[PDB]
Amino acid sequence: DATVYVGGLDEKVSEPLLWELFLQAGPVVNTHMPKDRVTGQHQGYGFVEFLSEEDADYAIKIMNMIKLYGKPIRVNKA
Amino acid sequence: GHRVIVSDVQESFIWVRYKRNENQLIIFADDTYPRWVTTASLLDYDTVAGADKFGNICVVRLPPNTNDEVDNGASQKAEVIMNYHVGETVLSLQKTTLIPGGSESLVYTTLSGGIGILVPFTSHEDHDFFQHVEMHLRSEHPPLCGRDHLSFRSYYFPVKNVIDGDLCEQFNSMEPNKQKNVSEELDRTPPEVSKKLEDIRTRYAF
Amino acid sequence: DALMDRDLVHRQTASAVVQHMSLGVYGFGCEDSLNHLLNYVWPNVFETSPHVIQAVMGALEGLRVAIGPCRMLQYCLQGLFHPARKVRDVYWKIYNSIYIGSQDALIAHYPRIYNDDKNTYIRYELDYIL
Amino acid sequence: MFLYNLTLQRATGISFAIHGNFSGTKQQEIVVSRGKILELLRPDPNTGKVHTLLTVEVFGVIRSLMAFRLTGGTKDYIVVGSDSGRIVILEYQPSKNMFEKIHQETFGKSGCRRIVPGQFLAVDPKGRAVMISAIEKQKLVYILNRDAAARLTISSPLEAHKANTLVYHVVGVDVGFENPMFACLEMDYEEADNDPTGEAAANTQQTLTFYELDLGLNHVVRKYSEPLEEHGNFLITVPGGSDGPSGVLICSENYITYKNFGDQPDIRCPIPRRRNDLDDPERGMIFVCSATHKTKSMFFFLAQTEQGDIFKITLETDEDMVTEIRLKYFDT
Amino acid sequence: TVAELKQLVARPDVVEMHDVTAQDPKLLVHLKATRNSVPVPRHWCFKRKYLQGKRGIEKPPFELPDFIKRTGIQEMREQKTMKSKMREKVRPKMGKIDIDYQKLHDAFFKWQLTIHGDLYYEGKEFETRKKPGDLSDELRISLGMPVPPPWLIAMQRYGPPPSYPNLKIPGLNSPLYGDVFGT
Amino acid sequence: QSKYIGTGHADTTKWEWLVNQHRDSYCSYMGHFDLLNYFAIAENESKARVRFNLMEKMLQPCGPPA
Amino acid sequence: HAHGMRCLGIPNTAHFANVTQIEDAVSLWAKLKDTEEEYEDSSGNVVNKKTYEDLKRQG
Amino acid sequence: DLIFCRKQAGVAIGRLCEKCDGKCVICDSYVRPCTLVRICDECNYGSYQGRCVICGGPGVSDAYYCKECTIQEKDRDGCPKIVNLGSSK
RNA sequence: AUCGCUUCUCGGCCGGCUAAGAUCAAGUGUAGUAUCUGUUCUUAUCAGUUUAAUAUCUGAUGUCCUCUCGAGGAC
Numbered sequence A: 001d002a003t004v005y006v007g008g009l010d011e012k013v014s015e016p017l018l019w020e021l022f023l024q025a026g027p028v029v030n031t032h033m034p035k036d037r038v039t040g041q042h043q044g045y046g047f048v049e050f051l052s053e054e055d056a057d058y059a060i061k062i063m064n065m066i067k068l069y070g071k072p073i074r075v076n077k078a
Numbered sequence B: 001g002h003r004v005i006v007s008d009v010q011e012s013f014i015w016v017r018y019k020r021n022e023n024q025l026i027i028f029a030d031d032t033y034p035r036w037v038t039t040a041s042l043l044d045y046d047t048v049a050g051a052d053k054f055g056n057i058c059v060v061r062l063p064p065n066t067n068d069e070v071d072n073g074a075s076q077k078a079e080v081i082m083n084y085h086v087g088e089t090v091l092s093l094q095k096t097t098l099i100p101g102g103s104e105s106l107v108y109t110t111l112s113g114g115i116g117i118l119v120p121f122t123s124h125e126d127h128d129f130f131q132h133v134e135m136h137l138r139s140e141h142p143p144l145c146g147r148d149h150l151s152f153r154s155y156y157f158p159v160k161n162v163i164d165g166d167l168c169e170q171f172n173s174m175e176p177n178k179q180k181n182v183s184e185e186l187d188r189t190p191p192e193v194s195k196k197l198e199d200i201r202t203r204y205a206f
Numbered sequence C: 001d002a003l004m005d006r007d008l009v010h011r012q013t014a015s016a017v018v019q020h021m022s023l024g025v026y027g028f029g030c031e032d033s034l035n036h037l038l039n040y041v042w043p044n045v046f047e048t049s050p051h052v053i054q055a056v057m058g059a060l061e062g063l064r065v066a067i068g069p070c071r072m073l074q075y076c077l078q079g080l081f082h083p084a085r086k087v088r089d090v091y092w093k094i095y096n097s098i099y100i101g102s103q104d105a106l107i108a109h110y111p112r113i114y115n116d117d118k119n120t121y122i123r124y125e126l127d128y129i130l
Numbered sequence D: 001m002f003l004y005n006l007t008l009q010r011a012t013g014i015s016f017a018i019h020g021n022f023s024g025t026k027q028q029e030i031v032v033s034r035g036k037i038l039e040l041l042r043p044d045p046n047t048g049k050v051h052t053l054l055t056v057e058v059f060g061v062i063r064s065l066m067a068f069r070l071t072g073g074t075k076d077y078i079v080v081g082s083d084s085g086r087i088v089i090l091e092y093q094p095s096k097n098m099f100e101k102i103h104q105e106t107f108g109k110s111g112c113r114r115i116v117p118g119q120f121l122a123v124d125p126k127g128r129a130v131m132i133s134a135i136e137k138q139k140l141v142y143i144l145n146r147d148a149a150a151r152l153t154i155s156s157p158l159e160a161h162k163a164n165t166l167v168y169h170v171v172g173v174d175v176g177f178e179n180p181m182f183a184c185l186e187m188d189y190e191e192a193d194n195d196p197t198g199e200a201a202a203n204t205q206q207t208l209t210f211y212e213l214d215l216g217l218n219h220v221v222r223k224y225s226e227p228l229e230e231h232g233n234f235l236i237t238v239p240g241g242s243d244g245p246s247g248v249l250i251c252s253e254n255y256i257t258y259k260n261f262g263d264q265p266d267i268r269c270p271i272p273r274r275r276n277d278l279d280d281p282e283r284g285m286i287f288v289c290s291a292t293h294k295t296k297s298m299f300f301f302l303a304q305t306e307q308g309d310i311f312k313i314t315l316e317t318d319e320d321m322v323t324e325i326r327l328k329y330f331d332t
Numbered sequence E: 001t002v003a004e005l006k007q008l009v010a011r012p013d014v015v016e017m018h019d020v021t022a023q024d025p026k027l028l029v030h031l032k033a034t035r036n037s038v039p040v041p042r043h044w045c046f047k048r049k050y051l052q053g054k055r056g057i058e059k060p061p062f063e064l065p066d067f068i069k070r071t072g073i074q075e076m077r078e079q080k081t082m083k084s085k086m087r088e089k090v091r092p093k094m095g096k097i098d099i100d101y102q103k104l105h106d107a108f109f110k111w112q113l114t115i116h117g118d119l120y121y122e123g124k125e126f127e128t129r130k131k132p133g134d135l136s137d138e139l140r141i142s143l144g145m146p147v148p149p150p151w152l153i154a155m156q157r158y159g160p161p162p163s164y165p166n167l168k169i170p171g172l173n174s175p176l177y178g179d180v181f182g183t
Numbered sequence F: 001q002s003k004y005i006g007t008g009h010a011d012t013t014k015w016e017w018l019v020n021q022h023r024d025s026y027c028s029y030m031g032h033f034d035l036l037n038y039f040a041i042a043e044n045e046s047k048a049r050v051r052f053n054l055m056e057k058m059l060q061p062c063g064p065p066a
Numbered sequence G: 001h002a003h004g005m006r007c008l009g010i011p012n013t014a015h016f017a018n019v020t021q022i023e024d025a026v027s028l029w030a031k032l033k034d035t036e037e038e039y040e041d042s043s044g045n046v047v048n049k050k051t052y053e054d055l056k057r058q059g
Numbered sequence H: 001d002l003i004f005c006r007k008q009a010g011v012a013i014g015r016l017c018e019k020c021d022g023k024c025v026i027c028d029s030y031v032r033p034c035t036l037v038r039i040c041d042e043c044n045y046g047s048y049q050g051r052c053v054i055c056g057g058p059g060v061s062d063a064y065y066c067k068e069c070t071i072q073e074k075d076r077d078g079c080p081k082i083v084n085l086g087s088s089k
Numbered sequence I: 001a002u003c004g005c006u007u008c009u010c011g012g013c014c015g016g017c018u019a020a021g022a023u024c025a026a027g028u029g030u031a032g033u034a035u036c037u038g039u040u041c042u043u044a045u046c047a048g049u050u051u052a053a054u055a056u057c058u059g060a061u062g063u064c065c066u067c068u069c070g071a072g073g074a075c
């Protein structure tokens, strides 16, 4: 479970408000939030690696309460 | 009547409030320096005065933001607002008003047999003036042994916010050319200067 | 901003600034901010570049006189006995610089060190109470 | 916040006292040293009421204090042993009612140190050379000669340096118009540091050494050494040449010993005890200080115990050879 | 033994990996825990020579103290052909800044960090001083809550986080003002 | 530095460092009239006997080395 | 690692962030882990709070 | 190759030539001349009378210490007459 | 309506001629540091030096016998 997939975001969000955002729950050890080079903008889906698995299963339970730019945030195991 | 001030023999002051219902002893603050403490005194609720076995006088004030109810080796501390070396060990500290109709002041004896006082400034004018006094006096009238004044009062801890009166009073003993020329560097007159130092003594003490 | 290092010359020159400032302001009661700056000064202690190490030396000497030895020594304690050779070389160099001057005023600030079998490491004179 | 400091009552504690003629008068002005304070008193031949002519604060820790005189001179200066690295020679101008700084010399660092001089202070009876010393490793000498105008000029320093050597006390020695001598109590701890057993803690006697200044060779060489039987705290000048023998008295635990060179053998006497004493027998005795009474007729000494017992110390001499010593109970 | 050596100290946590190799651990144990003394910097055992330019390339060049900003010098300082430069010598114009000596006798008087318990090390900037219970402004704006952050409503149901066990967040076991809703 | 007593180095032992600070403390005691007087007050002796016991403790303190 | 510690009964904190073997941290955790209410006979100055409350229920 | 002699400081006044004239010896600076230089006649003698403390020319003035070296008390060490690590002449 | 061609319209990517006109700026040395580039260790094990620990450096490849590195026997 150490990693999660996160959908439905707005590009003003970046890797930092994800950092800050999910460490509110529990620390994101490895952050991945693609920067698209071609048009220089984000599609808004994320992958998160944690310290171990327990962090991330609690993360499955609590985790999908985040709302990025008035809008819904997908978090599921991976 | 509210809090309690612990004085360590080594690590100095420990602020301790007694919670009445839980009956617990609560250390919410401590000193930033080790100091060998003879005795303590309260200038006010938020300040503490203390003397060193080595004959130093420190004053440490709480920050106004202190947390009154709580639960390296500490959490929050108190800045040290004054350090002055008397050169003579002080066994008691008492705040009082020496003379009737006088201004409230601080009192320290010493082990040498001397009795002296610390006094607050009510104005920045006398402040800066006495500052220039100390300044031009030092180099223009060095201490007798050749030892420097500043270091001697900064001896264990660097001086913070203290003007030495016993140096300022030596204005009397200097030669008239010293007295005058310095007064010119001060842009005053020997009577002006002299009486103006008589001011603090008179008003506060004998 | 400068002492936080873009490139060594920043740390060096800025450190020299801390030095001359530190001699200049002495005795006037500004020590606090000089302590804050001493924080950022402190990591630069380690390097082999002659100009930056001698610079840092001058720096910590001026900071010695301005701040007073007590705070210095409180940064220099743990480094004395640390296992590594490097750290001991340096912190002992510093501690010597602090030691030669103001050796008279250091007395109060040596902490309490417990006594072992063959030796009594507690100085009991300071614990005589009237 | 800011605090202005005032003294009100100046300290009455007197650490040192030196008696000399500072006005060029037949009267004797008494320069005493309060803790941080230099002080000058005038007792009165008739009524004895002690007049305070001057009180001055030096803003520095006084360490030792001695008065001296140029040879056959009219007047007396002051030597201030201080906590700074500077010896200063002072003169009290009778008119101006205050001291002047006659000489300022810088021999080393600041504050009470282990190796930095100013601690112990001695001077020659003829006032030729003053010797200053620390507790350890550094013993310096300044030579004094009046100028062409007979005003005092100080020479360049010298060095007695002896490694790892503790100095209990230093006392001027009397040799009339000679190469000056100095009595330095010493001890070596280098035996004690290298002896893991702890034997050198015991079985190590403090070495009495006489240094000889030499004007012509203009250096200070170690000359005389004897091991002291038991540890004495301080020494006493014995005026030599014309008046009396030239030697030194040594105040030691439960003893006093005149111990001198030439062929002069040591003379020991026990420190007398009072009949039926209530103190712990395990508590011994030494002498605190001594004030020599020197007269054109005779001379003697004054000693005191912990208990306050002042004795008059006398010398029984055959020509320049002292055969024995006589101590009579004086007062308390 | 590094094991039993940890029983002799009030704060044995101070003992570390290489600490057991010390020439005198039986002391250093007692020093390193001294009351107000500060730890040794950590950049050694890292072979990187104390810095790299990774995080240092995203920093601003500099920003002035507000006391110097209100003055107005910032706009005065801001380009020139070579012959205009030799004209600037032949022509020359005076008084481009034209500062107000009243203002620069004012600001630094009329108008005009860290404590001892801190020391800087290589990579540390923001983090320690975004934590469970502490967030930035804007992300509050995206969240859009007027002055708990609402998923600490679900930190009620599902339980305190495994990742930060020591946690307290307002209103639950932590009995809150401004931004910071948990400590 | 070497000829300046009290100089430390990387190989400095505990025992030597603490006996140093001891001896320096004792020179301070000999130095300051007051603190000395404090000692005389507390444990009852003469100023003299105090300084004498100290001068005895100069070489020893902590006792034998290791 | 913290699961082994905490489920082992050794709480997870820095204190233990050194030693590996299961045994030693058990004694370390053992290393990790009284008032006087004055009875009326003047002998209860040794008597505990709860004990004197029990003698309140008895009295 | 070039280092202090550090013999005991005497009463002899320091002497600097044209070149070195303004320099405070140790800090290498021209700022705030305050106190005065002292070196031993062992370092200053004879052909060294009124000699430069540095280059070996005739002294036209006297060196003054800065205030910087004053507070750090360096002026109290051994005589700061530089000796080349050959002889002094 | 679709395919192809064409016309128009719109949107998105989206410095003259002459002899070429003529002419053309570099201090040194003593110490010292930094930053670029290129190239080298899959070595196995043990012993010693060494290191905070590594690293590094330094030495050899179970023993005996028989036969032609291999085989057998005794440990």
Ligand SMILES: [Zn+2]
Binding pocket: H005, H006, H007, H008, H040, H042, H043, H079
């Ligand atoms: Zn010399």
Ligand SMILES: [Zn+2]
Binding pocket: H016, H017, H018, H019, H020, H021, H052, H053, H054, H055, H056, H057
């Ligand atoms: Zn020159």
Ligand SMILES: [Zn+2]
Binding pocket: H024, H025, H026, H027, H028, H029, H065, H066, H068, H069
């Ligand atoms: Zn200088």
